[PDB]
Amino acid sequence: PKPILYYDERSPPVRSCLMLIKLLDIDVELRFVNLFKGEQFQKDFLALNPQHSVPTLVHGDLVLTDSHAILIHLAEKFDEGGSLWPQEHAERMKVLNLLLFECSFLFRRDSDFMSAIVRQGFANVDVAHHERKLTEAYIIMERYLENSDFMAGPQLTLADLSIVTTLSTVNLMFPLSQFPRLRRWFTAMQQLDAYEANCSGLEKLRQTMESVGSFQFPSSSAVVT
Amino acid sequence: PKPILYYDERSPPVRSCLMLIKLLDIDVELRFVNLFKGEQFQKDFLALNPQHSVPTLVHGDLVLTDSHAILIHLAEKFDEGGSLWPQEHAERMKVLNLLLFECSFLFRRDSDFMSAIVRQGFANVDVAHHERKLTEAYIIMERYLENSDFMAGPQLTLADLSIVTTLSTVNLMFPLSQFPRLRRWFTAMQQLDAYEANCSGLEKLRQTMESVGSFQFPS
Numbered sequence: 275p276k277p278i279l280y281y282d283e284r285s286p287p288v289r290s291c292l293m294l295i296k297l298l299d300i301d302v303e304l305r306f307v308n309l310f311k312g313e314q315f316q317k318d319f320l321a322l323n324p325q326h327s328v329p330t331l332v333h334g335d336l337v338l339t340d341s342h343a344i345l346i347h348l349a350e351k352f353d354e355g356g357s358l359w360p361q362e363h364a365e366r367m368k369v370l371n372l373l374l375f376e377c378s379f380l381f382r383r384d385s386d387f388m389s390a391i392v393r394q395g396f397a398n399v400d401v402a403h404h405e406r407k408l409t410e411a412y413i414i415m416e417r418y419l420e421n422s423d424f425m426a427g428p429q430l431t432l433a434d435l436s437i438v439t440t441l442s443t444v445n446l447m448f449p450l451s452q453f454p455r456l457r458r459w460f461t462a463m464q465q466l467d468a469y470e471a472n473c474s475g476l477e478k479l480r481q482t483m484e485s486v487g488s489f490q491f492p493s494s495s496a497v498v499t
Numbered sequence: 500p501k502p503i504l505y506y507d508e509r510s511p512p513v514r515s516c517l518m519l520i521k522l523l524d525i526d527v528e529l530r531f532v533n534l535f536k537g538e539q540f541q542k543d544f545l546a547l548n549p550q551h552s553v554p555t556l557v558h559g560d561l562v563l564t565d566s567h568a569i570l571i572h573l574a575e576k577f578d579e580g581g582s583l584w585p586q587e588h589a590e591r592m593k594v595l596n597l598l599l600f601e602c603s604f605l606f607r608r609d610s611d612f613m614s615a616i617v618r619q620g621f622a623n624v625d626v627a628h629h630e631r632k633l634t635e636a637y638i639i640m641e642r643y644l645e646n647s648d649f650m651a652g653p654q655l656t657l658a659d660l661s662i663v664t665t666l667s668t669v670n671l672m673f674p675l676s677q678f679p680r681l682r683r684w685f686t687a688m689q690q691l692d693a694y695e696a697n698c699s700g701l702e703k704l705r706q707t708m709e710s711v712g713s714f715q716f717p718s
């Protein structure tokens with residue numbers, strides 16, 4: 275049976291799975307769950323994923339409720355032996371380490387900021403506080419890239435797919451002027467054909483946030499190529 | 500060389516790694532990083548881990564900066580063919596999915612609550628708000644346990660090691676009386692020889708939080 279992806283493309287971790295699906299030409303059925311309309315609290319979706327989060331994948335009997343498990347599962351099933359989720363143990367641990375950085379640090383901080391805008395309205399958010407927390411994530415990713423061309427080594431891996439979507443979301447608000455390696459890496463990701471899967475949801479998230487939060491992102495911040 | 504574990508046993512993800520190390524008899528060199536003195540910001544540790552977090556594992560040239568990668572790495576290198584990190588793909592993805600639940604949901608929410616204490620003082624924290632967020636996590640784990648004795652199936656896995664330490668930390672503040680499956684699972688986890696690895700750090704966290712929070716946990 276073909277994988278079923280419950281999704282809202284405004285979500286960065288959803289867009290990471292959409293990028294992998296495009297990169298590998300995976301046939302997947304998409305089922306939209308509108309997060310800003312609260313459809314993730316619908317009783318049948320809650321029964322499927324009590325964390326009420328997207329992406330959720332159903333593939334046969336398997337139900338995955340975290341983008342990072344979804345990326346790993348799809349790579350193992352549709353890129354066997356590939357370099358996205360590498361075969362050598364130490365290389366694979368490095369990718370796993372960076373996936374968890376995305377989950378535990380970069381996404382956590384971007385979610386904290388964006389959730390505050392939705393709950394409080396932009397004018398009531400302590401933007402300076404979130405600028406510090408997210409610039410700290412920029413600094414860390416800049417350090418990762420001072421060693422390798424890609425986040426987890428010399429070539430594109432699942433870590434880049436996970437990180438680039440949330441990075442593009444942070445960068446709607448906060449500029450990358452001071453981060454040359456991060457800008458070089460982001461520019462290169464934007465040249466990838468798979469990056470087309472990030473574009474639509476990023477823009478829909480931009481429009482939704484500006485509406486619900488009653489503000490405008492500074493147009494000069496976002497890196498476009 | 501033997502793995503090096505940078506740790507502060509007050510950290511629940513540290514304690515998860517300590518439990519696995521004891522369960523598998525792994526010979527490791529422990530290096531204490533006092534989080535309450537800010538030693539995670541010392542220049543050499545920051546150079547090692549820019550996220551300034553424990554646990555951090557150095558194993559040869561490999562540097563891991565997240566407990567969930569460390570658990571998987573140590574299981575793969577020291578417990579090949581074990582049940583903690585199952586070899587069958589569907590079972591392994593199930594364990595991975597629960598490891599990420601611990602990272603993304605349970606630990607996130609407990610960390611939000613504990614950080615609010617250290618920042619604001621216990622007397623100023625919106626306790627009811629965090630009670631709702633953390634009770635929601637209890638409700639989810641209770642459902643995870645409906646058809647299995649452990650978090651990811653009929654056997655103990657890495658998911659149980661990761662979740663039990665944070666669970667015990669949430670349980671400093673919020674009791675398990677209303678969750679029969681979760682309470683029975685936690686009691687069973689406490690019978691493990693390896694659970695002794697959780698005991699010392701949990702009580703150190705209690706004592707440290709209560710002094711800095713100028714409060715006492717209801718437990």
Ligand SMILES: N[C@@H](CCC(=O)N[C@@H](CS)C(=O)NCC(=O)O)C(=O)O
Nearest residue numbers: 285286287326327328329340341603
């Ligand atoms: N760590 C999880 C994070 C998933 C997550 O929190 N998704 C957000 C959207 S970016 C969501 O579904 N929010 C809906 C809700 O929490 O109710 C993953 O990587 O999939």
Ligand SMILES: N[C@@H](CCC(=O)N[C@@H](CS)C(=O)NCC(=O)O)C(=O)O
Nearest residue numbers: 378510511512552553554565566567
């Ligand atoms: N997702 C990470 C979380 C690690 C983490 O946040 N550890 C806390 C202690 S519980 C820490 O080191 N805090 C110090 C700091 O953030 O400066 C993991 O599982 O290892």
